[PDB]
Design a protein around this ligand. Sequence first.
Ligand SMILES: CC[C@H]1[C@@H](O)CC(=O)N1c1ccc(C#N)c(C(F)(F)F)c1
Length: 249
Amino acid sequence: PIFLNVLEAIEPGVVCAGHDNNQPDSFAALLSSLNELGERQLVHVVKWAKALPGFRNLHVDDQMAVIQYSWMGLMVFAMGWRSFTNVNSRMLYFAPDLVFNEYRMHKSRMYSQCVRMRHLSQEFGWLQITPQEFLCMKALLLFSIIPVDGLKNQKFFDELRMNYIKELDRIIACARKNPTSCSRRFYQLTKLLDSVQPIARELHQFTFDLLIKSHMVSVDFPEMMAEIISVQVPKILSGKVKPIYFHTQ
Ligand SMILES: CC[C@H]1[C@@H](O)CC(=O)N1c1ccc(C#N)c(C(F)(F)F)c1
C-alpha cells in the first residue's frame, strides 16, 4: 500500500483564512478573505505537489506550471470534500473560519458559482466516495490541465498521468468478482473528475474579472495570487492551456 501511504502522509492539514466573523458580511471583506485563503492554500498545494510520487520526473519549469494551472481545480475539489465531511455539503467550508451559508453565497456575488461547487460537494455523498478514492482523484487532478502546444518535456508528464490513472483504478470501491461493478465505478469517478473542470473555469473567469476591477471594489489580492491570475490564468481563458477530459464534452 505504498502509494496510498504516501498520499495520506502528505495530505495538507487545516488552513484558516483569517476572516473576521464578528463583522457584518460584505462583498469586499468576503472576497479579500477568499483571496488570502487562496494564497495560503497555494503555498500548501505547492508543498503537497512536490512531495507526490514521481513529481520530480517532470522538467523543472513544467513543475511550477502544472501546479499553477491546476491550483484552482485542486482547491475546489478539496473544498468540496471538506464541505462534505464537515457540514454534509449544506454549506461551503472554505476554511474553519470561512464557511459560506446561503447569505454569504449571495453577498459574495458568487451565488451561481457556489451552486456549482455545492453540487460537486453533494456528489461525494451521492456516490459514497471513499477517503482513498478522494486522495487518488485529487492527485490525478494535478495532471489534468496542460498547454495545447505541450510542456517542456511532455513525455514525462504523460507517463505520470498514466500511472496516476492506474493507481486510481487500483483502489476504486467495487466488487472485483463482478467486472460490471468496477466498470460502473470507474465511469462514475471519471465523470466526477471531468465535472471539476467547468467549475474551475467559472472560478478562473470570476477571479480574473475581479482582479481587473479590484481597485474599484476595494478587494485585496496577495502577491503570488495576483501573478498566477494575470500570467497563467489568461492562458487557460484564452484556450492556450486546456483541461484533459476523460469523456468528450
Ligand atoms: C482564488 C480566488 C478566490 C476569489 O477571488 C474567487 C474564488 O473563488 N477564490 C477562492 C479562494 C479560495 C478557495 C479555497 N479553498 C476557493 C475554492 F475553494 F473555491 F477553490 C476559491
